[PDB]
């Protein structure tokens, strides 16, 4: 048995040496030349009140006009962003919703939580009332993030250390992703959809093959749990947010950490992370009741988005990059621009 | 400015808002309780007895008061990342059995640790706790089989039920690191039928009265 441990240690040392050999020049040194982005001023264009409990997740529609938000009050509210109007109000079977997702085509919206089940809702049914389409059971731990890979199949990350890919029409998970020591907390699909990356409480992020069904790379460097993770728009990098009060940028091809976003005055964790359309900005929520805009290339604090009275729980930048909406535990979503 | 169906959509949104407010006002009056403790501490026995793969929700009704009990023992997953969603729970029910000395893998001390963590959690500073010292009946002979010396070498009283039960109650209540913010209600259920729900109702109404006193400024 000890031989396997020695082999694993040798392999880890080889990985460390190989990654060290690649780090010829730090990102900070190469990006020091570029001009820095000035202070970023953003104001709340909309305040989407109506929730009566903590907002735990939100997702934009691909049309950049519709967004959905889930909360402990047990309701999914689909907002018309441009006019603050409610388009739908789905009453959840279980009010312990920890995530939500909006399908690429806008037909389906899904959510899940402590009930261990990913529910799928029809938004364009003939009867006229949004109704649950199928309940994807099979997980053993709370759901932490759902993302619609396609109108017919989605990938879920649970609290039982496993991410699984579901076939909506059939209702069973075709592929199961295992290898996380700790429970998974967030998930993000690549722009090309071929790969997705998940970060867990074991302080490590994994890159998975959606089709092949096996892990490709594991990225470490965080000191604590990774609450949130997001893909860089180019699809060759992703940024993680952890409880140790630092966001960090990982690169798939370089296969090693690339830059860390930390401040001395920032001592609390990160609840959500998102990128701007061009990728030059790395917005990230914090438990100190406000979000900070990070210059993804210089790691400088380019701005701050304060205005929530409680921990910010979720945020996301529209597909056209026009606005960023942040939802917090005070039951208010504010759309900045 | 608004067109015809824009006004229609605004009316639909206002109707949805009215429904949301009505549902929220209905749900605010409901009493939410969190059930904790070891799986073998009689949680299932008490919940099934006192009934009028994830979180299990139980609904009661007593004296025109609606209870919502969230039994979360099935969540074999890391805490501290879903416990914070129970911040607003009115009270926490904690079931501890007095017949766990025999099992060693230290059960009575696991319950002690869990009670300490749940009472001093930063999310439950104000949430009062309701203890249920289960398994009282068979504890009467189990203490005879094994005096309390096996668990509390510092115990100074006599090895009798009337003394040991009180000693355990004080040991549990002392574990509270913050006496003033939250109170602890103790009850020796002994697998009784009607006293469990009645005690839950009494503790809940006392907690609600004190919450209103705090809100209105009398406290």
């Amino acid at each position, epitope marked *: 048995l000890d031989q396997l441990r020695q082999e694993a240690e040798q392999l880890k040392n080889q990985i460390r040496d190989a990654r060290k050999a690649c780090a010829d020049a730090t990102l900070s040194q190469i990006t020091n030349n570029i001009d820095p982005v000035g202070r970023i001023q953003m104001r709340t264009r909309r305040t989407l009140r109506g929730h009566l409990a903590k907002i735990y997740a939100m997702h934009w529609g691909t049309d950049s*006009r*519709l967004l959905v938000s889930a909360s402990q009050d047990g309701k999914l509210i689909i907002w*018309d962003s441009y*006019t603050t*109007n409610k*388009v*739908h109000a789905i009453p959840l079977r279980s009010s312990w919703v920890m995530t939500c997702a909006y399908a690429p085509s*806008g037909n389906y919206v899904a959510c899940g939580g402590l009930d261990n089940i990913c529910s799928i809702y029809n938004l*364009k049914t*003939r*009867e*006229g*009332n949004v109704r649950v389409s199928r309940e994807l059971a099979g997980h053993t731990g709370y759901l932490s993030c759902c993302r619609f890979l396609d109108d017919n199949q989605i990938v879920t990350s649970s609290g039982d250390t496993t991410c699984a890919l579901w076939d909506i029409e059939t209702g069973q998970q075709t592929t199961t992703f295992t290898g996380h020591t700790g429970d998974v907390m967030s998930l993000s699909l690549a722009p090309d959809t071929r790969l997705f990356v998940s970060g867990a409480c074991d302080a490590s992020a994994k890159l998975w093959d959606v089709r092949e069904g096996m892990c490709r790379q594991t990225f470490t460097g965080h000191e604590s749990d990774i609450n949130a993770i997001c893909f860089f728009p180019n699809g060759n990098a992703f940024a993680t947010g952890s409880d140790d009060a630092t966001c960090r940028l990982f690169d798939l091809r370089a296969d090693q950490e690339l830059m860390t976003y930390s401040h001395d005055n920032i001592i609390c964790g990160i609840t959500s992370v998102s990128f701007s359309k061009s990728g030059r900005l790395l917005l990230a929520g914090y438990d100190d009741f406000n979000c900070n805009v990070w210059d993804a290339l210089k790691a400088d604090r380019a701005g701050v988005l304060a205005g929530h009275d409680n921990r910010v729980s979720c945020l996301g930048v529209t597909d056209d990059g026009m606005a960023v909406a942040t939802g917090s535990w005070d039951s208010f979503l504010k759309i900045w621009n | *400015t608004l*067109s*015809a*169906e*824009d*006004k*229609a*959509a605004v*009316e*639909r949104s206002k*109707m949805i808002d009215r429904n949301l407010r009505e549902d929220g006002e209905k749900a605010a009056r409901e009493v939410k309780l969190l059930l904790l403790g070891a799986g073998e501490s009689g949680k299932n026995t008490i919940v099934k007895q006192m009934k009028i793969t994830g979180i299990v929700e139980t609904h009661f009704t007593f004296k025109d008061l609606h209870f919502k009990m969230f039994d979360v023992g099935a969540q074999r997953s890391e805490r501290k990342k879903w416990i914070h969603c129970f911040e607003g729970v009115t009270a926490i029910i904690f079931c501890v059995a007095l017949s766990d000395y025999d099992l060693v893998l230290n059960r009575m001390h696991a319950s002690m640790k869990l009670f300490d963590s749940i009472c001093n959690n930063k999310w439950f500073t104000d949430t009062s706790i309701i203890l249920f010292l289960n398994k009282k009946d068979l504890f009467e002979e189990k203490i005879k089989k094994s005096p309390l010396t096996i668990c509390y070498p510092e115990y100074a009283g006599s090895n009798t039920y009337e003394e040991a039960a009180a000693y355990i109650q004080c040991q549990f209540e002392d574990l509270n690191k913050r006496k003033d913010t939250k109170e602890i209600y103790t009850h020796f259920t002994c697998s009784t039928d009607t006293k469990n729900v009645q005690f839950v109702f009494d503790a809940v109404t006392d907690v609600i009265i004190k919450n209103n006193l705090k809100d209105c400024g009398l406290f």
Partner: single-chain antibody
Amino acid sequence: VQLVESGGGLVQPGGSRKLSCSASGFAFSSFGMHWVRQAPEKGLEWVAYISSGSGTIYYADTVKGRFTISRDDPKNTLFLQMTSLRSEDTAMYYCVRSIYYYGSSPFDFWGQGTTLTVSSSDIVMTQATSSVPVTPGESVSISCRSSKSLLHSNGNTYLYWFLQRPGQSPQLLIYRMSNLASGVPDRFSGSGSGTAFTLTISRLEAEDVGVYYCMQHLEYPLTFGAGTKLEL
């Protein structure tokens, strides 16, 4: 989804009636409901509208005061109390579905129709040609024009196209003049500009024969076109 309606028959002038619409198979409590009436040989004519929850009620100026529209959501039925009828009130009456929210498709479903026979500022919509012969496999363009541009400030051209198959209630084809209604063969392609609209059919086939009615929705009262009839 199914909308039955009844109450029609022979009525003397100056009488009254209570047309009933029974809604089955959809959430009637959340749908705004219209009453669209078609003369024995003329085009459609909007009559009344009641929103969800009965908050907003409109009547055509031609029938204001005469009729009263009410709904009973628990009973899942829509009522139109009509009194003091005249010779001009003889027409089919269609209970027309309508749901308004961002991206919805109002007027999607139309009732079967009730035959009521009485014993003996508004935007103007004009259709260029009353009838145009057609052949299978050919392309046909139907042209329509309004009085004032329907392109509202928010960018939606509130124009609709309806096809009335011979002997059947009309069904929605195109809403907002560009969006295609669900369930249609997808051959139709509606396009147009402000105050000028047209409907294009590619590879015309059987079952497309009928009368096409345009309808604006920018502001009430809603106005239908005369209608263009396709003949084989």
